[PDB]
Amino acid sequence: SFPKYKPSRLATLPATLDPAEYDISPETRKAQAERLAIRSRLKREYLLQYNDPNRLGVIEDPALIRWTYARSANIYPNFRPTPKTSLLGALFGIGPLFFWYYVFKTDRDKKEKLIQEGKLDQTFNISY
Amino acid sequence: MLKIIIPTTMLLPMTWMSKHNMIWINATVHSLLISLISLSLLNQLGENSLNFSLTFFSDSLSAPLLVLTTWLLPLMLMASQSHLSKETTTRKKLYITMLILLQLFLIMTFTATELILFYILFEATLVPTLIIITRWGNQTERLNAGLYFLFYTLAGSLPLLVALVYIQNTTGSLNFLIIHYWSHPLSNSWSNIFMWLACIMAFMVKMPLYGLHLWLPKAHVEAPIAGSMVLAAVLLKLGGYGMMRITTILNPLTNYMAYPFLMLSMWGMIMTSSICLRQTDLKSLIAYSSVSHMALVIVAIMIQTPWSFMGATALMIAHGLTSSMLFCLANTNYERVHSRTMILARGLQTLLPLMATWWLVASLTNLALPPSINLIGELFIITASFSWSNITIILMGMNMMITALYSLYMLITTQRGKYTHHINNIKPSFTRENALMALHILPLLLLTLNPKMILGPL
Amino acid sequence: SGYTPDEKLRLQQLRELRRRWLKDQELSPREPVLPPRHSIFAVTHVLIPVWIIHYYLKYHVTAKPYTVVERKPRIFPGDTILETGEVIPLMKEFPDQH
Amino acid sequence: SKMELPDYKQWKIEGTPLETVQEKLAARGLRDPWGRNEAWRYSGGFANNVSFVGALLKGFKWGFAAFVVAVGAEYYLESQ
Amino acid sequence: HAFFKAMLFMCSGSIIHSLNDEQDIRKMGGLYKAMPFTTTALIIGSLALTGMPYLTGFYSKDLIIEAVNMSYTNAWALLMTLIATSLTAAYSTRIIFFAFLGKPRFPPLV
Amino acid sequence: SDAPPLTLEAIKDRVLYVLKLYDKIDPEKLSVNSHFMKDLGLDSLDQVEIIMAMEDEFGFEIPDIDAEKLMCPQEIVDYIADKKDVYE
Amino acid sequence: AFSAPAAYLTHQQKVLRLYKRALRHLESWCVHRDKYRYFACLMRARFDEHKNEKDMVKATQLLRQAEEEFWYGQHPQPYIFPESPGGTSYERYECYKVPEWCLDDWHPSEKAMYPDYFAKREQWKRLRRESWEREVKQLQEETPPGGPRTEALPPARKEGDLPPLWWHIVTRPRERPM
Amino acid sequence: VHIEPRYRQFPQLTRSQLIQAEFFSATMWFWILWRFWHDSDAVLGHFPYPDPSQWTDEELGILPDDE
Amino acid sequence: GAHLARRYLGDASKEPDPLRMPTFPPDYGFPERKEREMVATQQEMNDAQLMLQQRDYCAHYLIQLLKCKRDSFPNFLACKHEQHDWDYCEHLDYVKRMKEFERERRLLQRKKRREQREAEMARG
Numbered sequence A: 001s002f003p004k005y006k007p008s009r010l011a012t013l014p015a016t017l018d019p020a021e022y023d024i025s026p027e028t029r030k031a032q033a034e035r036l037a038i039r040s041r042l043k044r045e046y047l048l049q050y051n052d053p054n055r056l057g058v059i060e061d062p063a064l065i066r067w068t069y070a071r072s073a074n075i076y077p078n079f080r081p082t083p084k085t086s087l088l089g090a091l092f093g094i095g096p097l098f099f100w101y102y103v104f105k106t107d108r109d110k111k112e113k114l115i116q117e118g119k120l121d122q123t124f125n126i127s128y
Numbered sequence B: 001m002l003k004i005i006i007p008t009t010m011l012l013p014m015t016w017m018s019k020h021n022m023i024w025i026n027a028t029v030h031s032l033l034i035s036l037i038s039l040s041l042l043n044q045l046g047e048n049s050l051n052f053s054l055t056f057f058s059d060s061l062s063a064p065l066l067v068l069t070t071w072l073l074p075l076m077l078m079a080s081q082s083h084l085s086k087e088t089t090t091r092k093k094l095y096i097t098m099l100i101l102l103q104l105f106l107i108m109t110f111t112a113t114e115l116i117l118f119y120i121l122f123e124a125t126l127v128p129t130l131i132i133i134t135r136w137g138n139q140t141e142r143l144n145a146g147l148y149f150l151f152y153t154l155a156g157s158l159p160l161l162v163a164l165v166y167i168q169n170t171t172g173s174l175n176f177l178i179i180h181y182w183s184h185p186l187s188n189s190w191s192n193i194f195m196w197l198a199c200i201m202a203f204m205v206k207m208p209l210y211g212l213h214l215w216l217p218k219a220h221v222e223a224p225i226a227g228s229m230v231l232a233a234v235l236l237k238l239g240g241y242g243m244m245r246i247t248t249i250l251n252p253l254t255n256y257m258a259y260p261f262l263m264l265s266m267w268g269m270i271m272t273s274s275i276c277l278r279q280t281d282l283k284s285l286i287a288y289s290s291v292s293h294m295a296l297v298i299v300a301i302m303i304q305t306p307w308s309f310m311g312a313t314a315l316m317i318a319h320g321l322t323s324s325m326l327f328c329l330a331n332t333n334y335e336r337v338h339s340r341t342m343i344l345a346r347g348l349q350t351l352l353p354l355m356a357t358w359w360l361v362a363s364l365t366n367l368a369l370p371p372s373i374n375l376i377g378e379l380f381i382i383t384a385s386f387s388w389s390n391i392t393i394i395l396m397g398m399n400m401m402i403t404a405l406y407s408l409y410m411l412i413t414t415q416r417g418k419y420t421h422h423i424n425n426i427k428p429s430f431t432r433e434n435a436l437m438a439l440h441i442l443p444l445l446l447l448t449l450n451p452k453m454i455l456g457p458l
Numbered sequence C: 001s002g003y004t005p006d007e008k009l010r011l012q013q014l015r016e017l018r019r020r021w022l023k024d025q026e027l028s029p030r031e032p033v034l035p036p037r038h039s040i041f042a043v044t045h046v047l048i049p050v051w052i053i054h055y056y057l058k059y060h061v062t063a064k065p066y067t068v069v070e071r072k073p074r075i076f077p078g079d080t081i082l083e084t085g086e087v088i089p090l091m092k093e094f095p096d097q098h
Numbered sequence D: 001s002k003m004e005l006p007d008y009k010q011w012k013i014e015g016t017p018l019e020t021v022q023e024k025l026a027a028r029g030l031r032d033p034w035g036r037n038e039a040w041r042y043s044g045g046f047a048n049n050v051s052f053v054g055a056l057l058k059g060f061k062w063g064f065a066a067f068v069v070a071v072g073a074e075y076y077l078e079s080q
Numbered sequence E: 001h002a003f004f005k006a007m008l009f010m011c012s013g014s015i016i017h018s019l020n021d022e023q024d025i026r027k028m029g030g031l032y033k034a035m036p037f038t039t040t041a042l043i044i045g046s047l048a049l050t051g052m053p054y055l056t057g058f059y060s061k062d063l064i065i066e067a068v069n070m071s072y073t074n075a076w077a078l079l080m081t082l083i084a085t086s087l088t089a090a091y092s093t094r095i096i097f098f099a100f101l102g103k104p105r106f107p108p109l110v
Numbered sequence F: 001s002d003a004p005p006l007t008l009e010a011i012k013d014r015v016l017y018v019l020k021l022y023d024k025i026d027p028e029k030l031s032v033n034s035h036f037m038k039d040l041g042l043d044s045l046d047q048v049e050i051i052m053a054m055e056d057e058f059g060f061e062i063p064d065i066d067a068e069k070l071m072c073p074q075e076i077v078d079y080i081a082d083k084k085d086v087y088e
Numbered sequence G: 001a002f003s004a005p006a007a008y009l010t011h012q013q014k015v016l017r018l019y020k021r022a023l024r025h026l027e028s029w030c031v032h033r034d035k036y037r038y039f040a041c042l043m044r045a046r047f048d049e050h051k052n053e054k055d056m057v058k059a060t061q062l063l064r065q066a067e068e069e070f071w072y073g074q075h076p077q078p079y080i081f082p083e084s085p086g087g088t089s090y091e092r093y094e095c096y097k098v099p100e101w102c103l104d105d106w107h108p109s110e111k112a113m114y115p116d117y118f119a120k121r122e123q124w125k126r127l128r129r130e131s132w133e134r135e136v137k138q139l140q141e142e143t144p145p146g147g148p149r150t151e152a153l154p155p156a157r158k159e160g161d162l163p164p165l166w167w168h169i170v171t172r173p174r175e176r177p178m
Numbered sequence H: 001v002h003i004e005p006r007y008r009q010f011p012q013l014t015r016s017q018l019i020q021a022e023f024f025s026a027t028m029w030f031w032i033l034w035r036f037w038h039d040s041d042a043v044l045g046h047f048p049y050p051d052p053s054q055w056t057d058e059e060l061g062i063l064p065d066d067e
Numbered sequence I: 001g002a003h004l005a006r007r008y009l010g011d012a013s014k015e016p017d018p019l020r021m022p023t024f025p026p027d028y029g030f031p032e033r034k035e036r037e038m039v040a041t042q043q044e045m046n047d048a049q050l051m052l053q054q055r056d057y058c059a060h061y062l063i064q065l066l067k068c069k070r071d072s073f074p075n076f077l078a079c080k081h082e083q084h085d086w087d088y089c090e091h092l093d094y095v096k097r098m099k100e101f102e103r104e105r106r107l108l109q110r111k112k113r114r115e116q117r118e119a120e121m122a123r124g
């Protein structure tokens, strides 16, 4: 009836436009109940320490520790040299260097050749 | 210049003979007095250096570095006494002894007239740093950090030693004045290329050069606060000082041996600035900042112009002060919350306003707000690079955009937003911490008032 | 629909406690127990700074060459010079397109 | 200070565009049960307001009178 | 431009502070009579912004438009300048019409 | 200065004022404890409209999860007072 | 914000939320009050036209079509209340909110001013300390063996009890703290 | 100056604010009228724009299509 | 505009090019032409420091206006005769430029038509 909205990576699909939430099953209801139970258990565990009058300091969060560890220390032990890894490493670690080397070498060779011929307009060029 | 060396050697037994509850007071007072004495080295000439004796001399390049070292010792002492309160008296005295020995080695390194004596002292600085890191670091990674700190250095410096002795068999001297006056060009041969690499790689790994920098995040994150202060502020500048000394014998080979290092420095400056944008640990962000600024310094030294040398000197001094201040600022929060994760403690401006002002000023100097000496050095280097090639303004320009971003990012993450609800142990700032921040920041602006003192011999 | 009796009761109890807490935030009449000419603005904010600036410019800045450079005054026909006394002639007998 | 709400029974949709809305809805079998809640936006000192041109020429009359008297003085001031 | 732009922003701020920090023009009704001085100032500022003759904005904007007309210039730039100087009056009209004319649309506690 | 310090009596007065201007509710039959569905015989859509009228009256929004539960003028007054830190 | 959410929304809840959203966006389109009232009555008639559909599948299909139409015809710049999550004053006063525990760190000279306030604070702290263990015990009793299944908390039931986990709700900073 | 809320009525107005607003609108209009009466050329233009077609070839110096 | 429409849509051959103008000798159609005189000396304009763009053939009126403005400083409404005279001189200058443009257009069109007609006569 109306023009259709299509989602993208940086502009996602709205919940009210999602087909999965319009055709539901008792299995889906059970899964939602389990999700809410997990969230409620975590919320109770946090709130018990949050309201503790004898608690002074920082309530340690295992999820934050897991996130930082995964982002920092768990990366190399889970690395394998593969065609994708090797190709991406070679590209993004070597290509820019040679690209910039070619650019700068060409520019400086042109400038040097111009200077040898004596046509660069270096008047008032005292500081370098 | 024994009038500076002997008082530090006297700091040693003064610390070891002090009463158990007066070590910090005595060490701080006499360290400040030694800094005041070393202030007299800033009276430099326009033609040559201050040649004190056959062994020691002072230039317009090494005098600000000596002043920075002697000024950094009392700040390190002030920053260390908080987390060392539970320590035994003997171990506290040993820690202070390590700091004093490091200062002595640095002072003698910056003024040695011969290159082998310079090499010996510049390697001798390794032992106290490694001991401090591996004995008084907090986490288990410190051990690995120590190893990364050691071998990365030595794998660079062992070839240099060989080259040095080889040079002394060829020219008959390693005295820097003789080396400068009797300079001869380097021809284009494979032997000369490898001599150039042997003379350059140790200082390159000290800066550090991008690709050879992996030791630095580990060592500067795992170290105690004084270790991080002295690693960022002074020990990184050994590479730059040594490179500016050693380049007098490498011409005209440098004219084309600098290309890989220039490309590495510029692209890796962009890369480390980008890395700072996605960092979960606050100390690692400051370490990668140091890497970017040192890449700028490497470019300045490699292009070999008077403007680039002046910019390099100014940038080294400014970065030393700024990075030490940033490490201390991060350490205050770490001591409060016992975690280095940046997003753990937020909205700290609401709880600690004056510390938030210190954070703002430190981050403003990091992004080189004019007319700070950070900006003066950065602008001189950028102008020299523009003369070297007009296209460099692209990469340098990109760097200027990224730096500010991550700098402000850091501030916005820690000071703004809302405070974390469950963190209830954030006590008001102590007088010691505020005094530490002030003693970092005031010399920066005072130096802005008179910039020719940090612009070097050029 | 609506609250369950448990939710309603918890809301009433929390509301009573919250209203007590908000009432307790009020200040008693003594709470801030503190422990123990006309044209002077134009003198300390205009006259003194202008004295200092005028002294600094008259006796220090202008003691060196090319520190205060003014563009020369405009000269028009029929003017007389203050220093030399020279007069400038008129302008070439206008055609008078009246 | 110490002011009370007006009587709620004076709010009527009579003589307002809400009357027109009600008459148009009644032609469709519908009803609007919220018009009296909006009647105050048309009832009292908000009953009438100027147009765009009328707003633009706000103080035109006094300005024109001053201009006329000034020009009249000027015309018979050159008779000196 | 400094004068009347600062005045227009100050009039907007006066409206915002009067209506309990509300910034949407769809909830500002008839303020022509309720806020007389602010109405007068905003009307004068809008007339100056549109280059109405002999006001402050006239002596710069009118000359700018005439200079753009009489120069050897890109024709598309001239056309966009004319369209923009029409749209200026258009959005000034939008502000005045929605904020000051008509019936109130703000909450009943005045 | 700013707006006066809203009180519970003022909140209740305004809530009742809004409710007596609703054509589907008899003014005399309305009290502060009257249930919208049981006592007054309104459905869910009328309750949504009542919540929206309250939002327009007091210049702030009530989330749907909280707005679903309010069923008498007293609950509305209590919710508004709790939101705005009114204790007198 | 105050009520504990459920595991899912029901069909009636979704219909009512769509009705409120549609009316708000229509008001955003219809700036004037009389026009908004007219089109809101039309929208209400359109909503209650299909109120008595006994086939649930057809009801959800109608809801789906209505949500698609809403997304097509939504106002790109709808009116937001200034303190609502999209408003111009949403989190304006969060920088002025200071947690109460900071008062424990005031210097005694600062506490010398306001003696009565700090006496009342001590009374409140004593009450919290005396109530905590009973709150914990009540939560232990009332919780099912497989952990809690919702985020709803019970009220106080005993003689002089307090509702469990009340301190951080009762001692909220304020809506306009400074 | 104390002005209290009104609750669904027109707000209270002081005489001074209306006087000021009316005076300033009147002075703007007087300035417009006066400046137009004295400086009309600033709007309508001062000098006649000529039509080039009415220039004879004698003053423009073009020969009579022969040479 | 009409000249723009004539040039861009019509025959651009007979339309003057503003950048390349004039293409005909200044004494082509005229028997003799007076040399456009200048009233202000270079030294007078230099002393008045007018501008490099205001040093046109109307510079004497501008100099008079500037002198009158400097002499009648507080009364900033006293330099009306001088400003009017300078405006009149600039208007005459613009009229002369318009006359040059129309002369160029007429010369171009007449010359092209005459050459084409002579060639057409030679073609029979």
Ligand SMILES: CCCCCCCCCCCCCCCCC[C@@H](O)O[C@H](CO[C@H](O)CCCCCCCCCCCCCCC)COP(=O)(O)OCC[N+](C)(C)C
Pocket (backbone or CB within 6 Å): B188, B189, B190, B193, B209, B210, B211, B212, B257, B260, B261
């Ligand atoms: C992770 C970062 C680590 C730090 C980075 C250090 C950077 C070191 C890079 C060295 C820069 C240049 C070294 C030598 C200069 C020229 C090299 C050569 O490629 O150039 C040509 C050399 O020609 C050919 O290329 C021969 C060399 C080929 C063999 C070299 C092996 C390079 C392959 C890459 C291996 C990776 C090395 C680094 C390991 C980590 C020039 O032609 P030619 O004029 O005749 O030689 C000049 C010398 N002459 C005059 C005495 C004759």
Ligand SMILES: CCCCCCCCCCCC(=O)SCCNC(=O)CCNC(=O)[C@H](O)C(C)(C)COP(=O)(O)O
Pocket (backbone or CB within 6 Å): F043, F044, F045, G011, G012, G013, G015, G016, G022, G025, G026, G046, G047, G048, G049, G050, G051, G052, G053, G059, G060, G062, G063, G066, G067, G069, G070, G071, G073, G074, G075
């Ligand atoms: C800005 C413009 C965009 C907006 C466009 C929107 C277009 C949508 C208009 C049409 C949408 C519909 O009617 S969708 C029609 C949906 N019909 C049904 O679901 C029938 C079953 N009835 C019920 O569920 C309840 O009676 C209930 C209706 C919830 C009442 O709740 P209460 O009685 O318990 O209060």
